[PDB]
Design a binder for this molecule. Structure first.
Ligand code: NA
Ligand code: NA
Lengths: 105, 105
């Protein structure tokens, strides 16, 4: 079986938000998003995929549709297919998210 | 948007493993599994769904195919469609897992 210690996979990118693939199949993307202060995933729309952001470390501002939320460790936000969504690190510390997208875009 | 504090949703069941739905759509099941010592998710096979177990608290023994692993906090294991899989709490403390299944069985 495929098994990973997500703590070990964590890494950052000074140029832009790091997208770290953990597992992948046509059925889903299981990734880690590592955001340094000021970094973000630009707002976008997935025609037929749902996405869920879960905060592992730090805090980020998640945008889904016409609403925004402060996602702190232990919190998860759902972005249904068709809804514009994104995430921004507006804090002064790094943030790490477990992000699942299904099916694979 | 749907947003939840998973820490608040956590709960246990003395009769059997608790399955706590967080978010759900035809595209995926996003659940929390709460296992008291001795509890487990019986081994089974999903014809067309992949599943990923992520340990939030405690440790569990995950079985996928002909292999078993000790999943400690921060570790994730992938169970591809068609593979017999299950999870058992063989420790002396409770365990909490974030479990994603896609698509919804
Ligand atoms: Na991988
Ligand atoms: Na819910």
């Amino acid at each position: 079986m495929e098994i990973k210690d997500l703590k070990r996979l964590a890494r950052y990118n000074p140029e832009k938000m790091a997208k770290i693939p953990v597992f992948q199949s046509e059925r889903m993307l299981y990734d880690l998003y590592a955001l340094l202060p000021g970094q973000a995933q630009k707002v976008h729309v997935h025609e037929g995929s749902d996405k869920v952001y879960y905060a592992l470390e730090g805090e980020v501002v998640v945008r889904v549709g016409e609403e925004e939320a402060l996602l702190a460790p232990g919190m998860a936000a759902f972005a249904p297919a068709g809804a514009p969504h994104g995430v921004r690190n507006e804090s002064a510390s790094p943030a790490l998210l477990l992000v699942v997208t299904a099916p694979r875009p």
